[PDB]
Design a protein around this ligand. Structure first.
Ligand SMILES: CCCCC/C=C/C/C=C/C/C=C\C/C=C\CCCC(=O)O[C@H](COC(=O)CCCCCCCCCCCCCCCCC)COP(=O)(O)O[C@@H]1[C@H](O)[C@H](O)[C@@H](O)[C@H](O)[C@H]1O
Ligand SMILES: CCCCC/C=C/C/C=C/C/C=C\C/C=C\CCCC(=O)O[C@H](COC(=O)CCCCCCCCCCCCCCCCC)COP(=O)(O)O[C@@H]1[C@H](O)[C@H](O)[C@@H](O)[C@H](O)[C@H]1O
Ligand SMILES: CC(C)CCC[C@@H](C)[C@H]1CC[C@H]2[C@@H]3CC=C4C[C@@H](OC(=O)CCC(=O)O)CC[C@]4(C)[C@H]3CC[C@]12C
Ligand SMILES: CC(C)CCC[C@@H](C)[C@H]1CC[C@H]2[C@@H]3CC=C4C[C@@H](OC(=O)CCC(=O)O)CC[C@]4(C)[C@H]3CC[C@]12C
Ligand SMILES: CC(C)CCC[C@@H](C)[C@H]1CC[C@H]2[C@@H]3CC=C4C[C@@H](OC(=O)CCC(=O)O)CC[C@]4(C)[C@H]3CC[C@]12C
Ligand SMILES: CC(C)CCC[C@@H](C)[C@H]1CC[C@H]2[C@@H]3CC=C4C[C@@H](OC(=O)CCC(=O)O)CC[C@]4(C)[C@H]3CC[C@]12C
Ligand SMILES: CC(C)CCC[C@@H](C)[C@H]1CC[C@H]2[C@@H]3CC=C4C[C@@H](OC(=O)CCC(=O)O)CC[C@]4(C)[C@H]3CC[C@]12C
Ligand SMILES: CC(C)CCC[C@@H](C)[C@H]1CC[C@H]2[C@@H]3CC=C4C[C@@H](OC(=O)CCC(=O)O)CC[C@]4(C)[C@H]3CC[C@]12C
Ligand SMILES: CC(C)CCC[C@@H](C)[C@H]1CC[C@H]2[C@@H]3CC=C4C[C@@H](OC(=O)CCC(=O)O)CC[C@]4(C)[C@H]3CC[C@]12C
Ligand SMILES: CC(C)CCC[C@@H](C)[C@H]1CC[C@H]2[C@@H]3CC=C4C[C@@H](OC(=O)CCC(=O)O)CC[C@]4(C)[C@H]3CC[C@]12C
Lengths: 433, 433
């Protein structure tokens, strides 16, 4: 009956019951070496890993983010030889589960976005979404040439992979800051959430175009923008009108509609052959339907919030589950760190410059500069795409260049992701109060 | 903006959207001939079938139950030549889905049982669950010998299969009657729900033993009663104490615990080798948990009721999905019809006699006598077990005897399942008012 004892006892039963129930219905998928056993065990390990980082090993002054534990828990499973064969996850299950978690964070960001602030920040959004991304790519190519044997063709390809803000790490931080409030709320959380959502299409277009040259598509990148806007706009108007207050259980009807269409848009676009259209399609759909509701949007986000907590450990467990290749390969990776360090440093400076027009006087520029660091999702999506092509085509010289790209690609998530989440967490309540 | 137009538009969108979403994640399972296409189409056909029987062809006086539509919808799929390979379903996903729906109705029946009435009905419950089951089986064996070539060995086997009350047909009707109330509520709804729950152990024990004799097990049938009581008690006292009001989201925590352990007991018991223990294990577990949840028992009920509505069309659609063998086989089934007709009539008389002790004065006897007719679930599970051994044990003489079991076993589901459900509908509010 004790509160502390009841909480620990209940959770232990509710986790053993989940494994036991699945093992009964499915004959062998829940035994060691099975497909459902790898997913369940990784889900449990990521859950416990986050709890340790913040409740037992919490630093006095800085609150250690739980995102570090989730990546660490997945890293140990993939790299430990004795816990790498009894637990395995199929690539097609990893990719399917990876994209579903991405759509959940996108709809929640757009759904809670305030449209009034977005109207006055039209000019700032395009500058923020174009400045740091393009500038860093050019610097990365120059930095790589003087410190690596990669030519200009492979120098530019690295830059686009490196420079892309991941919404999965900034969006959860912005929403928590906005809920607390600080008496100003100029629109910084809204600006950061919107700008980082559609930055992916710029990066993927350059990577594919550069990859093809080293092996046209310039117009194709523009088409992905048009399709996502048109599909998101037309479908967004059939959610605020057809579902009305007349029907019952409307809370569970407006929640399945937005999430179901978001999943359809993401997976359908990739199948056709123009990925990235669903990246912003689910942003416009939720944003348009978001303005249609002005009384029941409060209870819809609560349903989505519980869903995000389920996919939070699962998403980052999969992200840090393919770093076994570079687990321990000391080959003077100081140059790789040097390229990453300079590129990050240059990105900070340009971000401050791009917001020097008006409004943001002193602290807004500082907070925005340090909030553009995290790089989690897009880096792992196309991190090893180039290396596989080099291996496939039958050559070898290009494979070595691709391996170098992998080292810097995985290094960004390990380094810049946990630091960015930690910095944004404690500096938000200290600059724009 | 119109509710009439909104429901049809909204419901149509919510069914096409579900198919499109599942089709995107799974490449070919959503296409015709796939595994997930059979489950989706069968659920949709059974859904409209229930709506037609009550909104289009509703009789004036007798309300035609949706069960007739659900049984017919699955019947057409399995028998129509052109829609019998376009939609299919694996046996292992039919059996898994069949048992899960059975556990839902058991916990919802046990949860709504009233303890006060059960205390005074010790004598009536045991007599009701023993009288008709044994008496009807004996009459079926005698009638079969004088009207068929089945010897005494096969006569009793047919009787035990034929004599069994299905809880999935009465409990939904009993719960609705109890909720409405009629100013007396002597305990008839509680008597019928409890007595019919544990009637499975006798029917399976007789059928298995009789089949073995024609091919000791009395002791094992006894253990299934003991095992269910022992595990029902220990697992029933760890649910009304640990999950308490201190925990958050307690509504969704107690509903996962009762339903999760009910599924575990049913599937785990079958695997070990003593089925039927989980049938009454989840009945006692849910009843004991109800006694501790004095206040929040009704709040959890709203979630279980919605769960059954999902499995209502799926359960009966699968029930009428294996009648292709006897789709159209005119072989003078009048003897089979005559044997079933006599057995049903004899069952009515004996049930009236068994409850002529006290309490039920005049009208209660008539209502209870006709409320023991519905027979749908247990028949289909063990109906074709005899014929499976006949075509697999190498003997062809016994194949004819097994075929006669299928004719009567499948004929009872078509006839008595809908009539019994319809009979209680228009007779309940006319006898215990
Ligand atoms: C097997 C039917 C899949 C049906 C397709 C899934 C529906 C997608 C709709 C998304 C809306 C939210 C649903 C979230 C998705 C789960 C729905 C339940 C489906 C399910 O069998 O779960 C399992 C295990 O799960 C538990 O750990 C135990 C619980 C994993 O699921 P999942 O979709 O990520 O996994 C997919 C997988 O990625 C595909 O490649 C498979 O072909 C597909 O069959 C499915 O396995
Ligand atoms: C494949 C993971 C199964 C994981 C085991 C399932 C969990 C059991 C827990 C029971 C509590 C209630 C859960 C209700 C069951 C659904 C859970 C999600 C699992 C799921 O992929 O759904 C699909 C499609 O479903 C939709 O129509 C589309 C949505 C069907 O489901 P299902 O379990 O009856 O079907 C099972 C089947 O019974 C097993 O024999 C198969 O081996 C298994 O792979 C699966 O086919
Ligand atoms: C703790 C509360 C929530 C009740 C749930 C208990 C379950 C966790 C128990 C009940 C039956 C047990 C199972 C019954 C027997 C076995 C022996 C063994 O099963 C096997 O046959 C595979 C290995 C072998 O060949 O022995 C492995 C564990 C297992 C499945 C047990 C695992 C744990 C189970 C599911
Ligand atoms: C907080 C922890 C419990 C989260 C889950 C960690 C898992 C990764 C651990 C927990 C229990 C461990 C398992 C305990 C027993 C075994 C059986 C073992 O196989 C043998 O024992 C073979 C020895 C023989 O020849 O008899 C293989 C590893 C495995 C699945 C272990 C692998 C790693 C597991 C799943
Ligand atoms: C605080 C919470 C998050 C801890 C969760 C603990 C789980 C990781 C434990 C609880 C029950 C354990 C399981 C209990 C029974 C078994 C059966 C066992 O089967 C064998 O011994 C394999 C024999 C063979 O080699 O064939 C393998 C480990 C396993 C799945 C255990 C794995 C680890 C489990 C899931
Ligand atoms: C935002 C998207 C939708 C439209 C813009 C796509 C850009 C990413 C493409 C368009 C023109 C491309 C550039 C044009 C040609 C080259 C040559 C390429 O390889 C060379 O340096 C050798 C050139 C030579 O001398 O032949 C280096 C990158 C670069 C600048 C390309 C980099 C990627 C660019 C900027
Ligand atoms: C209606 C509202 C909820 C928007 C959802 C529309 C979907 C129902 C559409 C969008 C993309 C369409 C699919 C894209 C193309 C095709 C052609 C075709 O796919 C194939 O290539 C296999 C058969 C063949 O060889 O042509 C069959 C239908 C399908 C999958 C379409 C089926 C219907 C889909 C899923
Ligand atoms: C209220 C109704 C719509 C519920 C669902 C009924 C389904 C059983 C129907 C609806 C659409 C029908 C399908 C429409 C088209 C086809 C394609 C057909 O294949 C061909 O046309 C091949 C012709 C050729 O050889 O070129 C096979 C049947 C199928 C899947 C039909 C089978 C039965 C379906 C699935
Ligand atoms: C009132 C509600 C319950 C009616 C529900 C209607 C559904 C039965 C319809 C809506 C969308 C239809 C599907 C839309 C697209 C396709 C792809 C289509 O693919 C082909 O043409 C097969 C070509 C080939 O033979 O390879 C087959 C029919 C199908 C599955 C249709 C089947 C019937 C569906 C599910
Ligand atoms: C509640 C459950 C767990 C216990 C009840 C078990 C009964 C269903 C068993 C116990 C003794 C069995 C009977 C004992 C022997 C026979 C002979 C059997 O076959 C014969 O008639 C030939 C006998 C011979 O060789 O002379 C037919 C049924 C019957 C009455 C059996 C039918 C089923 C009975 C009643």
């Amino acid at each position: 009956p004790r509160g502390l004892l009841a909480r620990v006892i209940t959770n232990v039963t509710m986790v053993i019951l989940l494994w036991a129930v699945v093992w009964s219905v499915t004959g062998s998928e829940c035994l060691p070496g099975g497909n459902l056993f790898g997913i369940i065990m990784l889900f449990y390990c990521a859950i416990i890993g986050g709890k340790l980082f913040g409740l037992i090993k919490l630093p006095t002054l800085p609150p250690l983010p739980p995102l570090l534990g989730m990546l660490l828990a997945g890293f140990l499973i993939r790299n430990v030889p004795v816990i790498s064969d009894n637990i395995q996850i199929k690539h097609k299950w990893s990719s399917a589960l990876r994209s579903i978690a991405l759509s959940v964070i996108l709809v929640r960001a757009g759904l809670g976005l305030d449209s009034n602030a977005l109207k006055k920040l039209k000019g700032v959004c395009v500058r923020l979404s174009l400045g740091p991304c393009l500038i860093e790519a050019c610097t990365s190519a120059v930095l790589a040439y003087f410190l690596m044997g990669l030519p200009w063709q492979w120098g530019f390809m690295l830059g686009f992979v490196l420079g892309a803000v991941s919404p999965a790490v900034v969006v959860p931080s912005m929403l928590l800051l906005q809920e607390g409030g600080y008496g100003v709320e100029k629109g910084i959380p809204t600006l950061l959430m919107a700008a980082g959502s559609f930055d992916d299409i710029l990066a993927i277009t350059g990577f594919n175009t550069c990859l093809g040259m080293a092996f046209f598509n310039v117009l194709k990148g523009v088409l992905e923008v048009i399709i996502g806007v048109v599909t998101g706009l037309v479908l967004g108007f059939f959610i605020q009108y057809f579902p009305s207050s007349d029907q019952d259980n409307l809370v569970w009807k407006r929640a399945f509609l937005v999430l179901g269409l978001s999943v359809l848009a993401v997976f359908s676009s990739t199948y056709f052959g123009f990925p990235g259209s669903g990246g912003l399609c689910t942003l416009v759909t939720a944003f348009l339907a978001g303005r249609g509701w002005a009384s029941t949007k409060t209870d819809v986000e609560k349903v989505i919030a519980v869903a995000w907590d389920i996919f939070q450990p699962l998403l980052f467990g999969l992200i840090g589950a393919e770093v076994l290749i570079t687990a321990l390969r000391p080959e003077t990776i100081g140059l790789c760190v040097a390229t990453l360090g300079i590129a990050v440093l240059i990105r900070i400076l340009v971000t401050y410059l791009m917001v020097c027009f008006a409004g943001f006087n002193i602290k807004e520029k500082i907070f925005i500069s340090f909030a553009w660091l995290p790089k989690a999702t897009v880096q792992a999506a196309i991190g090893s795409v180039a290396l596989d092509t080099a291996r496939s085509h039958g050559e070898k010289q290009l494979e070595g260049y691709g391996m170098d790209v992998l080292t810097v690609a995985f290094l960004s998530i390990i380094i810049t992701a946990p630091v960015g989440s930690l910095l944004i967490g404690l500096l938000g309540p200290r600059l724009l109060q």
